[PDB]
Amino acid sequence: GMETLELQGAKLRYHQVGQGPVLIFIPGANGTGDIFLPLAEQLKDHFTVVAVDRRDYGESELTEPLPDSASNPDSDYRVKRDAQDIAELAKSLSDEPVYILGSSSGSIVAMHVLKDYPEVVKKIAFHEPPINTFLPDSTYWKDKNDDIVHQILTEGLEKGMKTFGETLNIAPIDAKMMSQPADTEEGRIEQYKRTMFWLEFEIRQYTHSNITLDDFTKYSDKITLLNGTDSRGSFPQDVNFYINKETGIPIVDIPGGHLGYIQKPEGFADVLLNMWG
Amino acid sequence: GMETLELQGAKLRYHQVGQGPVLIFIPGANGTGDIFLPLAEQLKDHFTVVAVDRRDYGESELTEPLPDSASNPDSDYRVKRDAQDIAELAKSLSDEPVYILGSSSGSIVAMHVLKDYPEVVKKIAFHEPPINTFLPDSTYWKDKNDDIVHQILTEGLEKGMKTFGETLNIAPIDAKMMSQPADTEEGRIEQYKRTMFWLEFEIRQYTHSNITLDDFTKYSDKITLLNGTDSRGSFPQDVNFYINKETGIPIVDIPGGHLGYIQKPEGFADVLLNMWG
Ligand SMILES: *C(=O)N(NC(=O)OC)c1ccc(NC(=O)CCCCCCCCC#C)cc1
Ligand SMILES: *C(=O)N(NC(=O)OC)c1ccc(NC(=O)CCCCCCCCC#C)cc1
Ligand SMILES: [Mg+2]
Numbered sequence: 001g002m003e004t005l006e007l008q009g010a011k012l013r014y015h016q017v018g019q020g021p022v023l024i025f026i027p028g029a030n031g032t033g034d035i036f037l038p039l040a041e042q043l044k045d046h047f048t049v050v051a052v053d054r055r056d057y058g059e060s061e062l063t064e065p066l067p068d069s070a071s072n073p074d075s076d077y078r079v080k081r082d083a084q085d086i087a088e089l090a091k092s093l094s095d096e097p098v099y100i101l102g103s104s105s106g107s108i109v110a111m112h113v114l115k116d117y118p119e120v121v122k123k124i125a126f127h128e129p130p131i132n133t134f135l136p137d138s139t140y141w142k143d144k145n146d147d148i149v150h151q152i153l154t155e156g157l158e159k160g161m162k163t164f165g166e167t168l169n170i171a172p173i174d175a176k177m178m179s180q181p182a183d184t185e186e187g188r189i190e191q192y193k194r195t196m197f198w199l200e201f202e203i204r205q206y207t208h209s210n211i212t213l214d215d216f217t218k219y220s221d222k223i224t225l226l227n228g229t230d231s232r233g234s235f236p237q238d239v240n241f242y243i244n245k246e247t248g249i250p251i252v253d254i255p256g257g258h259l260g261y262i263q264k265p266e267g268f269a270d271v272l273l274n275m276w277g
Numbered sequence: 278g279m280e281t282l283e284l285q286g287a288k289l290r291y292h293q294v295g296q297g298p299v300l301i302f303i304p305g306a307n308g309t310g311d312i313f314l315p316l317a318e319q320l321k322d323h324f325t326v327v328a329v330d331r332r333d334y335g336e337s338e339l340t341e342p343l344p345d346s347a348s349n350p351d352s353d354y355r356v357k358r359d360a361q362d363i364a365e366l367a368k369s370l371s372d373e374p375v376y377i378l379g380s381s382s383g384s385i386v387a388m389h390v391l392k393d394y395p396e397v398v399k400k401i402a403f404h405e406p407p408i409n410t411f412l413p414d415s416t417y418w419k420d421k422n423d424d425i426v427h428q429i430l431t432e433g434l435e436k437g438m439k440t441f442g443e444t445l446n447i448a449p450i451d452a453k454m455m456s457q458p459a460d461t462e463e464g465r466i467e468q469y470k471r472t473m474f475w476l477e478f479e480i481r482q483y484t485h486s487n488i489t490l491d492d493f494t495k496y497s498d499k500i501t502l503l504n505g506t507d508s509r510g511s512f513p514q515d516v517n518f519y520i521n522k523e524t525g526i527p528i529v530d531i532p533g534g535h536l537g538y539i540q541k542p543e544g545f546a547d548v549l550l551n552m553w554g
């Protein structure tokens with residue numbers, strides 16, 4: 001069982017083991033304090049060992065969404081909020097300044113605790129910090145971090161989606177429109193996030209969901225299949241051809257390609273009005 | 278402003294234009310109804326046009342997080358919840374069954390609306406559906422989808438994290454341990470989410486955060502820098518060497534590598550006790 005400290009925007013969960021002065025361990029990229037529990041066992045007759053799940057990880061829980069801007073690479077919201085969490089935790093557990101150790105990005109949180117809340121620090125240890133900002137070659141290291149994130153979060157998708165368009169023989173006009181970069185960096189961040197979400201949570205689950213031809217035949221009088229005139233040869237049209245061949249449900253051709261409703265709204269509307277008006 | 282329907286677990290936002298029978302447009306991968314607004318203008322004399330932001334997209338908001346199982350590639354949670362959202366929207370706006378058009382994955386949502394809530398459907402259109410489940414060659418298309426997601430999400434991350442370890446000259450013992458798949462399937466999916474979160478929301482923001490050398494000198498007496506004995510040559514140790522070079526703050530060597538506190542807890546503790554006990 002873990003302890004809870006309720007703070008602005010999160011329930012902060014932590015392990016607490018031992019007796020003595022408070023010693024707070026701040027984890028790095030794993031984000032959870034359980035990685036310190038073997039160490040806590042070694043220290044528990046000397047310190048009250050406090051091993052934190054930082055608020056975005058483990059058994060901690062946000063009570064309010066992150067700011068939209070947190071995905072921006074120069075946001076400082078999260079590191080400042082993590083540092084304030086440690087300061088409030090220290091104050092909640094001790095009337096004296098406490099001992100603090102962070103490792104990896106947890107040591108960067110520790111630096112911000114010292115910077116913004118020196119009053120809670122008795123002694124502090126930075127174990128293998130990967131901060132580059134004050135290095136004489138900061139640019140070199142910053143750009144490497146930026147580029148490897150960009151590779152995983154945006155470039156893998158870009159290359160895979162081009163192949164996927166070929167698999168499905170998507171028309172070039174649709175591929176260009178579906179991949180057209182937004183005109184702001186924030187808009188582009190959001191575009192890539194949305195595609196990464198659709199990849200993980202939508203494409204497989206929806207395209208192999210439990211629909212049978214029998215589901216259509218029960219209500220065939222209500223159904224129209226639509227094929228774009230500018231997306232001939234693409235996989236979705238083959239799906240409609242199969243439905244039609246097996247069920248007789250009609251195919252209506254409609255202007256534009258996969259994105260025809262915004263490519264050719266007037267012609268698209270004219271067909272819908274013919275169908276249903 | 279966008280209209281709102283409050284549903285279980287989400288606030289569903291949608292555009293509403295026109296008068297006449299309700300016509301609901303369900304978007305595909307872009308997820309948002311704004312892509313139908315030029316079309317809605319052509320139809321607004323004949324239909325009440327309703328263009329939905331599906332609940333995971335746009336101005337719609339989840340009021341509780343996605344279930345953990347939504348990550349499963351055969352999960353039906355999201356597609357069924359999207360179809361129920363459309364049915365509830367129809368019922369909230371119309372006493373009569375309504376007209377519905379979906380495109381791409383939005384046409385799959387439309388198929389589930391017809392299957393599970395046929396009572397809300399007057400007429401329905403499936404614009405370029407990419408569902409494969411009932412096709413004779415379903416397996417070919419399913420496997421292509423499974424492969425492109427694995428390539429972008431799993432292979433992209435694995436290769437990128439190996440490059441990150443090389444860039445920082447992480448010691449082999451550390452690389453192995455930090456890349457070890459969890460011992461429980463619950464904790465493997467969580468490891469993916471946690472790594473992607475750290476990649477997007479932590480590494481760049483924290484490693485280029487606002488710490489200066491002068492921040493260390495102000496309270497230098499409080500600080501210990503810690504370098505692992507088994508992680509020599511790695512970038513985080515170079516950060517500590519630079520801090521030491523500029524500030525005189527001592528470096529203390531401690532057993533293990535980057536993860537030395539769990540690799541060698543006894544020896545790690547012995548050094549902390551020498552420091553602070
Ligand atoms: C329908 O709306 N679908 N699916 C479909 O047609 O069949 C499955 C759909 C699927 C995927 C997308 N978007 C997409 O491919 C764009 C991703 C690229 C983002 C921008 C990257 C720029 C360079 C590249 C490539 C749309 C529709
Ligand atoms: C500190 O704890 N760091 N930072 C550091 O050393 O320098 C910035 C840190 C950084 C990175 C990790 N890596 C890690 O968590 C491994 C992730 C591997 C991929 C996850 C597998 C998911 C499924 C697939 C593919 C640790 C520590
Ligand atoms: Mg790019």
Ligand SMILES: [Mg+2]
Nearest residue numbers: 547548550551
């Ligand atoms: Mg001793």
